[PDB]
Symmetry: C3
């Protein structure tokens, strides 16, 4: 019944520290030390995904990061991800509480289970049709409302209500491997598929969190229009850094409010269901 | 002169298709196969059976040694490989309980060894660029389809039949699979995209098995089982999958008999000639 | 001054000085390199698949090949690639000066930088919206005009004005990992996405050339229709080689003219912009 919130911070990334934990996992070392402490009465653990941002997205040890948070007793993970927009409604400065993704990563360790010595014993086939924890998604959305940040829900709001900057209540991300950005050809193809944003760090992090029995939700920071618009609006690293810094302030407020909103509810049945889903997805029984 | 290898997928972890005459615990130049190989006969036709995931289904799709499985069967003198694959549906007319004799695929796998050849010392010498436009052995595909007819299973061919001939359960006489890496299932977003591309089913094990079989000079065909990777429905899906396994077992046993009733000398030679004609290094030297 | 590398050499046009073996921080290049001159312009020729054509596309050391040309002082790289056509107006014997691509390769070393000891220390996030050097693209096209080869621009001209064999003034490529050719299902999917050609070797070569601060342009050689047409037109090795041997003399004329055209212009601002793009993409330093 205990609740403990892990926070995985991307580009641009909270409380007074109780302890710094140098941990190891059976999958290797996490990206950095883990800082443990409290937000109000809620226990919380913070972990930077890139550790002085020297580790590219394809080389982050997502297994060790998620497992380390599980081993410190986290029940939830809140994650941030920098991204580029593929659609006109999503402009730099907006946020997206994602609910879908398309995976184009490769060469990353994306599961804890297998038949090799470097993995846990078993064959795990996890359902991923709706790959995030829906309860935690709505917490992020309500947190933005409580902090007087606009929310745009395309299902129930006219397009004229999309007042920027705003938090988009839904969205799909294509995760590319990096480190290069997309070509205009690739951006047009992803947009034609109906995708909303492009990023590099969401997958396999989201999949491993569900394998570990954790509730996971992501808030993406729109820093650019990818490269499907005008040449002045094409992505570079400086464009990504120049927008993260301005938006980090507001995503901090959202994260800290979401931690408090998580602590204000009972999660006994959701945590139980997270664990049961893993056990029922074991094909080796 | 024929010998039929069988690679059993989910539902065939311990097949027992015939009385075991002998066993082969072997390795290959590309590592260990998934399990020991079981030898026997269907009538007078030699047969060898190998569970793709191992006896206890301990090996996930991404970690299956497709190269060792295909090579071990080639080493034993197999001329054909029949494989089973459990799949999910992406289209309205493919429903749980149906079967598909695949003729096409779209590859979204990565990180698997998918060729016997290359420039590394542990690969076979040479560069092989195989044609894959119609990646299966068409003659063996038609034997699987005829075996279903002979076992009283409906066959639906959307090229010549209207949709009212789609009577379930049925063998779809053609179809395309997207092969994904796994182990996780697809998101709704990914499934929507694969459906929009026109793909019929989704699976995790077809590729690179089919590609390696053609590299090895073997006639390969796959029969896929459509199941449901989803009030209560799990018990009905499992009973339905059990019934599908019994049907596929009947199809496999009849197909081995049908293969054995014909001569394959020309087709086997054509399979070997196709490998040689795809050796880029040799054809560059030829000119 | 400039110096042109050619990744993919007659007597009266290429004055061969010598053959060179080099090493790089990322291993050995595919083969030794031929150093020479086209007029007064220094030129280096490097075959992608090595001696005996024993190296398949997925195992080519693109990092070593590009870095070796960088270390020898090249300012430009011109590349040729055989390819299959996905569209009716691109026919065997044509050429394509690509301007776009979609990447379906995996497991290749595609960046010089990273956190492993096998790569240079750092994190490079390169923009790739328009991944080629446009000035060098337009030289390849103008080289074709100078050699009396037809040029077809589908933005300006009409399908009824396409004269073969022609250099297509733009186009997009899907790069697949190989070694196998595509299925018919994959071919039609790529065609439906709007792609023009399919190949195996463009990526990561084009990406690493930009990482190295070099101007890179590719002219593809259409050898086949992949496998979206009739059975006698489905791709195979013999078909690819038969057409390649007949088109290679035209593409040799283009590349030799392009090298002389590059030498006739100043590239000071372009080269400086190439290097400034690399440094501004170094996340670890910013
Ligand atoms: N366009 C983009 N593509 C990938 N990752 C990004 N991060 C920020 N913008 C991005
Ligand atoms: N159809 C094709 N596909 C991939 N690479 C090729 N190279 C030449 N033709 C090709």
């Amino acid at each position: 019944s205990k609740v403990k919130v892990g926070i995985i911070g991307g580009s641009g990334f909270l409380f007074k520290k109780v302890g710094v934990r140098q941990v190891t996992t059976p999958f290797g070392k996490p990206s950095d030390t883990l800082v443990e402490g409290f937000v109000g009465d809620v226990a919380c653990v913070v972990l930077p995904r890139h550790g002085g941002h020297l580790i590219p997205p394809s080389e982050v040890n997502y297994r060790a990061n998620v497992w380390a948070l599980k081993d410190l007793g986290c029940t939830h993970i809140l994650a941030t991800n920098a991204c580029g927009s593929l659609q006109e409604d999503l402009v730099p400065g907006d946020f997206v509480v994602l609910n879908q993704f398309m995976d184009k990563t490769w060469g990353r360790e994306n599961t804890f289970y297998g038949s090799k010595p470097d993995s846990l014993k078993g064959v795990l086939h996890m359902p991923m049709a709706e790959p995030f924890c829906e309860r935690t998604r709505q917490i992020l959305i309500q947190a933005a409302r409580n902090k007087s940040i606009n929310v745009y829900d395309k299902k129930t709001m006219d397009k004229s209500a999309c007042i920027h900057p705003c938090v988009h209540a839904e969205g799909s991300a294509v995760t590319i491997n990096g480190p290069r950005f997309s070509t205009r050809c690739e951006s047009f193809i992803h947009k034609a598929m109906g995708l909303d944003i492009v990023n590099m760090t969401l997958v396999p992090e989201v999949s491993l969190a569900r394998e570990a029995g954790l509730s996971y939700a992501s808030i993406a920071i729109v820093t650019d229009f990818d490269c499907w618009k005008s040449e002045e609006e094409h992505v570079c690293v400086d464009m990504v850094l120049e927008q993260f810094r301005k938006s980090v302030v507001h995503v901090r407020e959202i994260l800290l409010e979401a931690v408090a909103l998580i602590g204000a509810e009972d999660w006994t049945k959701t945590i139980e269901a997270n664990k049961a889903l893993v056990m029922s997805s074991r094909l080796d029984l």
